[PDB]
Design a protein around this ligand. Structure first.
Ligand SMILES: Nc1ncnc2c1ncn2[C@@H]1O[C@H](COP(=O)(O)OP(=O)(O)O)[C@@H](O)[C@H]1O
Ligand SMILES: Nc1ncnc2c1ncn2[C@@H]1O[C@H](COP(=O)(O)OP(=O)(O)O)[C@@H](O)[C@H]1O
Ligand SMILES: [Mg+2]
Ligand SMILES: [Mg+2]
Lengths: 331, 331
């Protein structure tokens, strides 16, 4: 009670928010790449420097951001993805909170450059000062967008001390891209570190062969033991690959990716049902290797938990669904 | 790009926030009880109805909220706990985001009643409408505060469908109070459900016997096997109780509470070090039973992660510290 209840200034408020949204360089990559995806990009190019502690540049060939909305994109609680509660309950995009860019900009030197198809001119924007005032100025850029994040945590020292080695931080970034690339086979994703190419996942044309990308992302080892899955029942449909439990090594066990309507996730309900389907067919219980995609009525699952967490309205039903699907294929 | 980037109205913005802050009735209880603690309360009384889906009332004998700050308490990004980045890096209170009440009020009928020692008059406040306009009116109330949360999720149907049985929801509430009561032995906490008293933990006077409350919260079973711990090394000090691994049952295994400077938490680093100290002394590896308190330089740990998660600057050091402390006592 000694200090009055007082509104937190823009920058400070965003930095506090950044504490949750910006865990490490990998977090920034995730947020930006997901924005490119929402913007309908077909190709995303990612350049990293020193594990991302020095630089993170992500360019996409998405639809871009209109000049008069650049500042809004750097603003808090402002989005183009939902306008009401209905939109949220049945969301189509990955984003909707309208907080990511604002948060990131408050704890780094973030530059937003973009041009829409209707604009002849490209523009660049960035916020500054305790009030996060935005400067918009001329720039050069093709249809699409480029986010440039420099000196992450430069103005938040307590956090900068927690940054691990360049090697460790880049690895988390590599892992993040790995999870996103598996979610969208139709999107070309290139990742580079310190001026050198680390990877590039070619987009798979309509109906093209996926085994190619799967192997490129997860490795040939997984690709060989990969058992495809096709299991449906109304709104519930399970797809993907499950490695033969009998031929699953701990190295392959590193591949445990699950998705709910394209949204990457790590839910215990699912990991359990799978390990159950394997333990029940196989002899011993162990860490299975898989890449599964669950399609379900968006109204039967909560995506606003805070991101890899989700909540299923019919917990039991879903769990048994996945269990059967995997169990079935394992036999 | 079809829909413009647009600011989310106050109520909607808060409801989206509520998706993360308000997981279930237990979340509301946690936020409110922690506010009472920050306000210096010595006694907190909690009344629940129908698992909290119908009513949640929390009254404290804290310092209260000044009339002219009631609306600010229901506002977003407004707090009395930090005013800058320094304050955050070495925080003293549990709160600091200034978002909890605003979020909760947007997804329930929340009434805030309070009176400070300097005021002869008590006042009541609550927000309404898409803009969250606040109404302040006369009320009766002793020094302190009472939060009243009714019909949780009444205006967010998609979420209301996820509410479990009254029994299940109250249980999470009981568990939450359990964790908070262990964090503060000096605070009397009474919990009631549907007009009937479920529990009441008496505050322990200065230096009074703690075994009494420990047993009342964790049960006599744990109290008997409880092995006290006193282990320090500079800023690092470990205290609490660890149940004899050899006499630990799965029922006792339900008691795994760890705290960093009074802030409840569930960090794997610690749970691992403990289970390691037990596995290494004991024969088999298992689920230990414990109530440990780690005191550490606030600058060596990050509390703004999003709450039971924390991040230690010197991960390895801390882990070995706890391991030794427990290991030592187990012998
Ligand atoms: N690469 C991009 N291409 C096009 N629009 C983008 C891009 N990145 C961000 N935006 C715009 O900025 C707004 C989002 O910023 P963000 O802070 O990520 O919030 P959110 O995605 O939850 O709405 C989006 O709603 C969209 O309108
Ligand atoms: N029970 C209470 N007694 C006194 N002050 C309170 C109480 N509950 C809330 N407040 C005030 O309301 C503001 C907090 O609301 P909240 O949304 O919980 O945010 P935070 O605790 O993170 O600041 C506090 O900063 C404090 O000034
Ligand atoms: Mg986004
Ligand atoms: Mg609070």
């Amino acid at each position: 009670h000694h200090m009055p209840i007082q509104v937190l200034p823009p920058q400070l408020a965003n930095q506090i928010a950044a504490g949750e949204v910006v865990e490490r360089p990998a977090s920034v990559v995730k947020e930006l790449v997901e924005n490119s995806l929402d913007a309908g990009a077909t190709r995303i190019d990612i350049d990293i420097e020193r594990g991302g502690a020095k630089l993170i540049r992500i360019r996409d060939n998405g639809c871009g951001i209109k000049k008069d909305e650049l500042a809004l994109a750097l603003a808090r609680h402002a989005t183009s993805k939902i306008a009401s509660l209905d939109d949220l309950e049945a969301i189509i995009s990955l984003g909707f909170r309208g907080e990511a860019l604002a948060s990131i900009s408050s704890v780094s030197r973030l530059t937003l450059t973009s041009r829409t198809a209707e604009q002849q001119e490209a523009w660049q924007a960035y916020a500054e000062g305790r009030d996060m005032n935005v400067t918009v100025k001329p720039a050069a850029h093709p249809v699409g967008t480029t986010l440039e994040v420099l000196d992450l945590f430069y103005n938040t020292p307590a956090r900068r001390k927690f940054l691990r080695t360049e090697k460790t931080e880049f690895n988390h970034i590599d892992e993040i891209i790995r999870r996103i690339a598996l979610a969208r086979f139709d999107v070309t994703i290139n990742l580079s570190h310190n001026g050198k190419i680390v990877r590039q996942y070619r987009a798979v044309p309509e109906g093209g062969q996926k085994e190619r990308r799967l192997g490129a992302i997860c490795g040939t080892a997984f690709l060989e033991q990969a058992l495809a899955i096709e299991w449906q029942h109304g709104d519930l449909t399970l797809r993907g690959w499950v490695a033969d439990p009998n031929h699953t090594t701990p190295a392959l066990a590193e591949i445990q990716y699950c998705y709910v309507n394209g949204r990457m996730m790590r839910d215990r309900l699912i990991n359990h049902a799978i390990r159950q389907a394997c333990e029940d067919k196989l002899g011993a219980d162990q860490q299975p290797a898989f890449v599964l995609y669950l399609e379900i009525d968006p109204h039967q699952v909560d995506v606003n938990v805070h991101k890899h967490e989700v909540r299923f309205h019919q917990s039991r039903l879903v769990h048994d669904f996945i269990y059967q699907g995997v169990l079935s294929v394992l036999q």
